[PDB]
Paper text:
In a [name]-Cas system, Cas proteins form a complex with a small [name] RNA ([name]) to detect and cleave invading nucleic acid (DNA or RNA) that has a complementary sequence to the [name]. The Csm complex, with the RNA cleavage site located in [name] subunits, targets and cleaves [name] at 6-nucleotide intervals. In this study, we determined the cryo-EM structures of the Csm complex from [name], with or without target [name], at 3.3–3.5 Å.
We determined the near-atomic resolution structures of Csm proteins complexed with a 40 nt [name] (from [name]), with or without 49 nt target [name]-bound, using cryo-EM single particle analysis. These heterogeneous particle images were classified computationally into two particle populations each yielding three-dimensional (3-D) reconstructions for the apo state (big [3.4 Å], and small [3.3 Å]) and for the target [name]-bound state (big [3.4 Å], and small [3.5 Å]). In total, the big maps contain 7 repeating [name] and 5 repeating [name] subunits, while the small maps contain 5 copies of [name] and 3 copies of [name]. The pentose moiety and phosphoryl atoms of the ATP molecule are in close proximity to residues His303, Lys635, Asp575/576, and Leu521 of [name]. The structural comparison between the apo and target [name]-bound states of the Csm complex revealed no substantial structural difference between the two structures. However, we do notice a small shift in the [name] proteins in the target [name]-bound state compared to the apo state. The shift is more pronounced in Csm2a (~1.2 Å) than in Csm2b (~0.9 Å) or Csm2c (negligible).
Residue numbers in the entry: 3 to 297
The structure:
RNA sequence: ACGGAAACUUUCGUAACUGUUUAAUUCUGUUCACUUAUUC
């Protein structure tokens, strides 16, 4: 509906452990950031009645290098396309190149299903930095960073309103993920109006071989009915909570969701799960609002 | 209500000791203040 192009430079997005880092990040990082900063501004109760309005949703961090990128379809293609049958060694060595691929181009969303295999474009390299502490037994730690290159940018698709544009205006000067108390999260928001005439297949009604993204999460009333005959991949996303009145900061429960680009068969619903381990004066919200692409 | 929050590759240390641009070498070899001339 409306994409928000933003580029990163020397950022950090861990996945499992603080020392490790990935080029992208899950969709729950953006939703858990605007709600945390809404209380500091003075409108936490205003955004609570907006996220639960069905039409309001968010997208994952997709690369943008002279064109929007989309994840590869999980399980596609099937066992029918061999792509130039020459030898069993040449066909087997090129099948892994598509497995290590991260995102596909906007113009290759239709040619990949017909029979085409190629190596993903080199977006950025994983670089790490070292730190220590002199007045504490000389201890040290290692953390990784993400330095984009070759004009590597990202974009998130949301809904146009007169309240969301002001909440994200301060996020570019406040950090986003990783070591926020250093400067690993500052970016620049490039606002736009017209997205693209091809990337308008986002629907949530009919079910014609759709594809769920942004880590799907089925509802209790529709789990196995949409899980049978599908392609998915279980991941992992958790960590310690961040509150201001606990004196302990309890651990959030595990929420093994899916991956960006899973192909099911029917249309889900999307709910908001509440993470309450012991007791908290507030409520740890979560995204869990997957979209669908016509493919 | 962000696998996050708290954190100096920091504290220490002359690129240093030693060693003549030195030894050898005449600004000298040839050269009339000269030629003509009554203090008558």
């Amino acid at each position: 509906y409306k994409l928000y192009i933003m580029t990163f430079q020397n950022a950090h997005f861990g996945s499992g452990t603080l020392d490790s880092s990935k080029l992208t990040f899950s969709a729950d990082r953006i939703f858990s950031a605007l709600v945390l900063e809404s209380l500091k501004m003075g409108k936490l109760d205003a955004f609570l009645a907006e996220a639960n309005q069905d039409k309001f949703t968010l997208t994952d961090a997709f690369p943008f290098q002279f064109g929007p990128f989309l994840p590869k379809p999980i399980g596609y293609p099937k066992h029918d396309q061999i792509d130039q049958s020459v030898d069993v060694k040449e066909v087997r060595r090129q099948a892994k190149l598509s497995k290590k691929l991260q995102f596909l181009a906007l113009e290759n969303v239709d040619d990949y299903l017909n029979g085409e295999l190629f190596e993903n474009e080199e977006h950025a390299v994983i670089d790490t930095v070292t730190k220590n502490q002199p007045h504490k037994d000389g201890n040290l730690y290692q953390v990784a960073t993400t330095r984009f290159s070759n004009d590597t940018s990202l974009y998130v698709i949301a809904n146009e309103s007169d309240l969301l544009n002001e909440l994200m205006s301060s996020l570019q000067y406040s950090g986003l993920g990783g070591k926020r108390s250093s400067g690993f999260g500052r970016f620049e928001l490039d606002i736009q109006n017209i997205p693209l005439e091809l990337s308008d297949r986002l629907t949530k009604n009919h079910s014609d071989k759709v594809m769920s993204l942004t880590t799907a999460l089925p509802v209790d009333a529709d789990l196995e009915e949409a899980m049978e005959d599908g392609h998915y991949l279980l991941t992992k996303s958790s960590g310690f909570a961040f509150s201001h009145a606990t004196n302990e900061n309890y651990r959030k429960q595990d929420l093994y969701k899916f991956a960006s680009g899973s192909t099911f068969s029917k249309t889900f619903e999307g709910q908001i799960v509440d993470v309450r381990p012991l007791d908290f004066p507030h409520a740890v919200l979560n995204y869990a609002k997957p979209l669908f692409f016509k493919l």
